[model samples]
Target: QYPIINFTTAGATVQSYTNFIRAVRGRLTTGADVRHEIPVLPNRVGLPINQRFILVELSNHAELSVTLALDVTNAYVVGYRAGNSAYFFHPDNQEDAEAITHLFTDVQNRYTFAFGGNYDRLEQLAGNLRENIELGNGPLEEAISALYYYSTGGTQLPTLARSFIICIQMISEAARFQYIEGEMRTRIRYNRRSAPDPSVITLENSWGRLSTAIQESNQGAFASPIQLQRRNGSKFSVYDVSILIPIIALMVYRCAPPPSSQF
Candidate 1:
């Protein structure tokens, strides 16, 4: 099980977190007319927060609200969008945006792991815990050890992100691309033998090709194109592989001692 915050710690105190929440609410409710930022890392503790992360939530007023994890690394670009595509988290189909629309409509609260602590530590923590196996070092080493189980290569995305989007739909539902690997070159179910519509020319059979891409990416959480969150607009369909995967790997690796040199 993960360790819950001590609460008494300077970072998890009720007052400090409350202040962060209030600031987030203000930013979302307003039209970006003003800005509200807090030194979330150093405010309560004498040290800087891990990732300088924070949370913000919104309400629909028409119905109930929900909470989201907001990591706005590339949201500042004028035309870029931020956040994961709702379909990615939904059951298994990102194309079901119509059904998952409710997720975005309401935002009750948000949690940010970046602001209160160092992500590298978090990565080591998770890495250490991936298994009962032993890690040879104290902290940083533990983080590296955990990378094995999660398969979060130093430069790759996570499986969660690969399955997050509904790119598979393009293969299972719409005949988009051809899956050609060695002797196994199977065309999409619909477009296997022929190109039927504009999706072929406009998307360059993107739907079909995207499936294979996601599949290949899923093979390793680290080596994925969808992982690195480049821009916000395109990010809607992307994930931060470069950041989250490495962090998780490092954190988990730190949780154990190095293997014994058995003769």
Candidate 2:
């Protein structure tokens, strides 16, 4: 489904971020505050790096396959930008490019972390996502990025893998060649009305036709390739398999008791 909604911004992209947050408020019970993305900014002094990137996953925010790919992409974007989103220092006007690069190098140098899955992990969110307005799409690390529901602050974006797995791969070759998914759904395929399948029957009284055709006067004898008749059964009867199984078990248990007790 890789129904990509990607829109690149050559200019400041923060407004789109804020807009997406607003659109999701109705879906989010907690009401996502767009401002909360960056909880705090650290004190950095040497340079003015106006460069910041934030990967706002507007959709597929819940799909694992998409998340994995997205998170990886984000990590790649961040690394390409030099880990400024997850962690950054106030680079002074005098800070060298090497100084900023070392921030990433230091994290890798000192920690038992891979800058990916270890960022943060919860049972629900199985990846790393910093609460920063400064971040990019996944791939910065070897971990799951963020996991949110499509209903919750997340929109449904189907990944190519997911679309193929559930749709293209599942459909037959003939159906795929015919583009079955794009074909118009008809009364034969879907029951649009309140009635059962073959919905057209309801509008035209199809059951009346069947009843009339089955009348005794219509045929000398009901003969067919296969006899199609309803068996007389109790429709009002309640079937409790729980009751049935226990009764059968008790009958068997009484007879299958130890030999001394059996006699």
Best by TM-score: 1
User: What's the CA error at residue 133 for candidate 1, in Å?
Assistant: 25
lDDT of 2: 0.21
**Local error of candidate 1 at residue 56 (angstroms):** 6.4
lDDT of 2 at 67: 18
Which 10-residue span in candidate 1 carries the lowest summed lDDT?
72-81
Q: Candidates' lDDT values, in order? A: 0.22, 0.21
| lDDT tens digits, residue span 15-83, model 1 | 433343334332222222111111111111221223222232222212212122222211110010123
With candidate 1 superimposed using the best TM-score fit, by how many Å does residue 47's alpha carbon deviate from the native?
38
TM-score, candidate 1, is 0.16
User: Any idea what lDDT model 1 has?
Assistant: 0.22
What would the per-residue lDDT of candidate 2 be over residues 99-134, giving only the tens digit for each residue? 335333433322211222212221113221221111
Runs with alpha carbons beyond 4 Å of true place in candidate 2:
1-12, 30-134, 137-263
